[PDB]
């Protein structure tokens, strides 16, 4: 359209929509983080792990940034990295205990 | 300041919200990709058997790099599987500890 009377309000409406759009994305991301966070906390409570291990994992999960999605992503990165480290540590102990018992270990599917 | 000049000002504002909006998505996609690569290299620096690492990498480079909402869900999935595996290994750990007549603590 070309009439000033039509373009201006039309563009105004368009601007209000981009804003509503932008806000929706953020909200949806902050909402996705909230659900993800609670979901992992409940799944964790479902494990047979010792209270001390759970406490330490829940702490890092509960601390994920809930407002900035970019920081949420690095906080998730740090969580995964810490889990991998702990798993690694425990695995070595597992190995030593295996030999100690004259046992063996292998990998399979479930 | 004429009525007609209101039009160029809005368009400029429209473009901004569009760029900012396109940027937001670009940074998220690059962040996902960067932390995906980052983690995969961290995993290689561990002593975990090749199978365990291969198994974890498979799940990592499996993360959705386009849609952030799905990236988040795959991240949760990766995290859930790590927790479950840790839980299983810990249980095998207490079981072996109890046969070697040893004890564990923190």
């Amino acid at each position: 359209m070309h009439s000033l009377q039509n373009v201006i309000p039309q563009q105004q409406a368009h601007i209000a929509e981009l804003q509503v759009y932008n806000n929706k994305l953020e909200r949806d991301l902050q909402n996705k983080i909230g659900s993800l966070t609670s979901s992992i906390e409940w799944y964790l409570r479902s494990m047979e792990l010792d209270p001390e291990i759970k406490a330490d994992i829940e702490q890092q999960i509960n601390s994920i940034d809930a407002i900035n999605p970019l920081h949420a992503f690095d906080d998730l990165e740090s969580v995964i990295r810490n889990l991998i480290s702990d798993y690694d540590k425990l695995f070595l102990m597992f190995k030593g205990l295996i030999q100690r018992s004259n046992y063996q270990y292998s990998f399979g599917s479930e | 300041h004429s009525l007609q000049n209101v039009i160029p000002q809005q368009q400029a504002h429209i473009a901004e919200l569009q760029v900012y909006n396109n940027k937001l998505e670009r940074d998220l996609q690059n962040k996902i990709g960067s932390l995906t690569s980052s983690i995969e290299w961290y995993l290689r620096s561990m002593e975990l058997d090749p199978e365990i690492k291969a198994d974890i990498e498979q799940q990592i480079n499996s993360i959705d790099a386009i849609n952030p909402l799905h990236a988040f869900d795959d991240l949760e999935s990766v995290i859930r599987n790590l927790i479950s595996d840790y839980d299983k290994l810990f249980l095998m750990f207490k079981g072996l500890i109890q046969r070697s007549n040893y004890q564990y603590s923190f």
């Binding site: 001390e52 330490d56 540590k89 425990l90 070595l92 102990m93 190995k95 030593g96 205990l97 030999q99 100690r100 | 750990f93 500890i97 007549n101 040893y102 004890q103 564990y104 603590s105 923190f106």
Partner: peptide, 22 residues
């Protein structure tokens, strides 16, 4: 908080690194 391996028949000595060795 780290996971350690005790030994009741040794005063509960930490045999962790030992075991992680063999």
């Amino acid at each position: 908080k780290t996971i350690r391996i005790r030994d009741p028949n040794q005063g509960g000595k930490d045999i962790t690194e030992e075991i992680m060795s063999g």
